[model samples]
Target: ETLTVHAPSPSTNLPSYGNGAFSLSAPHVPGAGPLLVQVVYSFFQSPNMCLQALTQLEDYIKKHGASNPLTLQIISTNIGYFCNADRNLVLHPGISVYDAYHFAKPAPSQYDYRSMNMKQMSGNVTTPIVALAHYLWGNGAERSVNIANIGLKISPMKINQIKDIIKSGVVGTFPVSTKFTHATGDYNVITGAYLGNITLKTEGTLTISANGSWTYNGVVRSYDDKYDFNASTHRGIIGESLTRLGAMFSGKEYQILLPGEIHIKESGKR
Candidate 1:
C-alpha cells in the first residue's frame, strides 16, 4: 500500500520561532511514499540550509522505512512534551494528523492567527514527496479539496496552518535575492571558472539576533541551534537529523537575503 506524506496541520507544537528541522524519505517515489519521516521540529529558515542534511539522511531513513509501524510511532515522539500528545504519522491509521494537540488556543490577534511571520521564518518542509507533488502540480482547489476530504471538518483556524505547511512546499518561490548560494552541487563549476573573487564583507550565515536584528556571521543558521534540544543527547535523524544538520551548518557557509511580502486572505472563512 502507498502511504502519502501528510501536512502537519493540527499540532500547535512547532513554535513560530523555535530551533527545529525535519526529514522524510521513501523507496518508491510515485510508488510507496515516505515510509519514514521526521515530522516534528521547531526551527525555520531557507531550504538550502537543509539540503545537505537531507542528502545525507534521506537514504538513511529509506534504509529503515520498512520497520514496524508501531516502532516508528514510539521513536517519532520519543520526547518529553511529545509523549503527552502527538500522532502516529507514517504509521498512524489516518493519512493526516488532525488536531494533533490538546490545548489549541486562539492567538492574541489576527496577525498571530495568520502566523504570516513566514517572511521572517522561511524554511524547509520537504516532506520529500508532497513538495515534489506541489512542484509538479500547482497548489489549487484540487489539493485544498483533497486535504479537506481527509480532514475532520476542520475549523477555519486550521486553514492558516495548512497554508503555512503548503507555503513550505513552495521553496521554488523563495525571494529571488535569497537564492540558495550555499549549495555544494556547483562548487566544482565555480572552483574552475573563477574570473575574479568579488567577495563582499557580508553574505553568510543568517540569524535574527536577540534584539530582533539580522546577523550574518557567514556561518550557521543562528536560530536553528540556539536553545533547542538535540544539542547533545537528543540528536537523532530525519527532522531530528535536520537539527544536527543545522548545528553542523554552524561552521559551514550560508547567506540570508532580506525582503518581505505579505499575502493575507482568509477566504471569507471568518
Candidate 2:
C-alpha cells in the first residue's frame, strides 16, 4: 500500500467565502497497489476552506480515475464540529445538511468513506489520535483511491521521510515560527507550548487588534470569532500557518510582528 499528501498550490483556486467547495487530486504512482488518503482541519468557523479542498480532491479523482476500478476512503478529524444532528457533513447554511453526506449511514457496502469522531475519546487519547491523524493526513490526500489496483508507488524510505516531516512540522514538538502580517503597528504574539499561554504585545502602537481563540478550548467555539483583519486591502496574516509549517520543514525558528489571530502552529521552548 502507498500514501500521498496533497497541498493547495499557488495556481489552485479555492472559494473565498465560508463553506464553499474545492478539490485536490492525488498523483498516480505505479505498482503501489491501493492507496490511503486522509483530511483534517483545525477550524470549524471556516468550513469553506476544508470543504473546498475536499471538493477539489473528489472532483479530480472522478475526472481522472472514476472508470479505473477505483476505491476511495475518506475520514474526518474532529468531525463533531462539521457534522449536524443527522451525522452528516455541513456543506452550506442553506443546503440540506444530509445533502452534503460524504459517508453513507449503516455502511456503504464498501470501505470507501469513513469519518472518525474523536469527541467520544478522552482528552488524553483524543490528543494522540488527532495528532497522529494530523501527521498522516494533514498534508496528505483527504481521501484514498485504488484504481484498478494502481497505487502510489510509495517506498518505505519515502514514507518515513514524509512521516518525519509531518511529525516535526504539525505535531507541535519544536518551536515553529509565528508570524502576523499586514496592519500598521509593531506587535508580537507569543504562543506557548501546546498552545497553552498566548501573549499579545502592541508596543503601544495604534488600535490594530486581533480576536478569536478565546472560543477555543482545544477547538473553536464559534465561527463569529474567526476573522482576518485588514484583508479588504487583500492583506493580513494570510497563510501564516502554512508559512510557519514550511519553515519548520526546513528546520528553522522565527517570529513575526503584526496583528492576527492566535493559534499554535508548533511547540516551542517557552
Candidate 3:
C-alpha cells in the first residue's frame, strides 16, 4: 500500500508556535488492501524526543479491520516532552506510528484508551476510536456527532509563546540528522554496511553572559563511542552496540564539524 507523510499545511493564520516536524497518516490503500505495521526510530538531534508506544491503540474505536484491525507497533529511542501535549499530533483518535525500515521487529500493542480519565479532554466525539470512524465516514446522516476539547495548552493567540514552540525545530522527524561532519565536509551515510548499528549519545553545556538567547551544545555517538558534533547549536552522540557489524566504519572518525555559534542564555533566577 502507498504511505504518505506530511507537514501540517502551512496557513498564515495558524498559531505561531508549533514544531515543523512531519506527521504520519494512514488511509485505505486501494487494491493494496489493509496493512499491519511495526515501527522503530532513532534520534539524531534535539531533545524531548520519544517514541510513544501504545500511544495510538485508541484508533480501533470506530473502523473495523473487516475482521482483525490494523495494528501499530512503536519503538522509541527516548521518551521525553514528545508526548506532553496531544498538540504534537493535530489529528484525533489517530496516533503517530514509526517507519518499519529502521526497526527489527513489530512492537507490542497492549493499550486501552478507555482506561484513561480524559473526562475533560475527550467527550462523546473526542473518543479516539469513534473520532477515526467519524472523521473518515461520520456525516450528519449517521447517528450522532460529537466534539471534544483536545486541549491546546497555548491558545491560538499569544503569538510569541506559540512561536517559540515552532522555532525549536525538533520533534516528528526520523533518525533525526545528527548533522555531524568529519574532518572532511560531507554528509554521513545513516544506512549502510559501515554505520548500521550505531545508537545515540548526547552531551551539552549551557551558559548566558546575561540576558541573551539560550545556548546549547549537543553531540551524537555510537556504542563504541564513535561520535559527531555538528549543527549550529545543540550536540548529541549516537552509535550501535555491535562494533563488529559496523566494521566498514572502523578507523573513520569525526569531530565538531560546524559547531554551535548561538548567543548563550541562562536562567534569570540564577
Candidate 4:
C-alpha cells in the first residue's frame, strides 16, 4: 500500500509570520496509526524545552505499542523572545499565536532517539528527547546530523536607530545595518566581528541583503533568507523570523522578539 502524506498550511498575508496554531493528519490504517496536531510556540525557546515534550510523546507512543499510529499535539509559546528571558513562557497572559509544521513518521528501525534528563529553572525534572534529522525524515545523507539553534542579537545603536526611524513615521524600505552575534551548541557564544544588512519595510516585510554573514571559528555562514514582520507595538519590532546559519549540518533557526510591546518612560520632549 502506498503512504499518503499531509502537510501543514503555509501562513501568508499576516504580520509576524509563523505565529499560529495548525493541524495535520497522517493516513490511518484501519485500527492503527494516529492523527498528529502540533502547536508552534516556545518549541524553539530553548534546545531542552521541546526535547522534554518530545520525550513525553515518545513515551506515549511506546505505551500503545511501538508501531502504533498515534495522535499527538505539540504546543508551546515564545519563552525566549526577550534579550534576557526564561526559556519557558509563564502560564499567565498568553502571547500571540505562531505557525507550526507537520511531522511525518520515519521508516521502520531507522529512527534515532536521544534522551537527556534536564533540571529546568522551574525546579521540574524532565527527560528530554532529541530526534536527529534522520529520525524526522528517513535514511538519507541530510538526516545524518543533529540540528542546532543559533541565537542572534542586534547592536544597541542599531536598535535605537530603527526605533527612532519608526517613531518618526518613516514607513518604507530602508537600509538597516547592525552588529550582530551568534551562539550555538548549548548557547556557546561565538566571538567575532559580524555585520548584517537587511531592508526594513514599515509596511511589513524584511528583505535580507545578500551580505549578512557571521564569521565564527574561521568559518562563515549567511543568514540571507527573507522574513516577514507584523504587529508592531511601543516595544521593539515584534515578529517571528527564520535565521539560518552553519553549513554541513545547518539547522533551520526560528526566532522571535517576545512581548512585542515596548515600554517608554515619561521623558517626553516638547
The lDDT values for all models are: 0.23, 0.23, 0.21, 0.21
Candidate 1 similarity to native, TM-score: 0.20
lDDT, candidate 4, 40-116, per-residue tens: 23343333333333343344434653333222112111111110021121111132212111112221111112211
Point out where model 1 deviates above 4 Å. Answer: 10-48, 66-270
TM-score of each: 0.20, 0.19, 0.16, 0.22
Tens digits of per-residue lDDT for model 2 on 1-270?
233322111122121211133222233344532332222122221323333433443454456542232212222211221222122322132333223333444221211112432222111111211222333334322211111111111111211122332223332222212221222111211111111112222111111112211110111011122222111211112223223223222211221122233221111120
For residue 112, give model 3's deviation from the true position in Å. Answer: 45
Clashing pairs in 1: 19-43, 20-42, 20-43, 22-239, 23-239, 45-122, 45-123, 205-218, 237-241
Q: Model 3, residue 78: what's the lDDT?
A: 9
lDDT of 2: 0.23
Instruction: State the displacement of the C-alpha of residue 120, model 2, in Å, after optimal TM-score superposition.
Output: 20
What's the lDDT for residue 171 in model 2?
A: 26
Residue 268 lDDT (model 4): 16
| Top-TM-score candidate index | 4
Ranking by TM-score: 4, 1, 2, 3
| Candidate 3 deviant stretches above 4 angstroms | 1-237, 242-251, 254-256, 268-270
As for lDDT, the candidate ahead, 1 or 4, is 1
Ordered from best to worst lDDT, the candidate numbers read 1, 2, 3, 4
TM-score of 3: 0.16
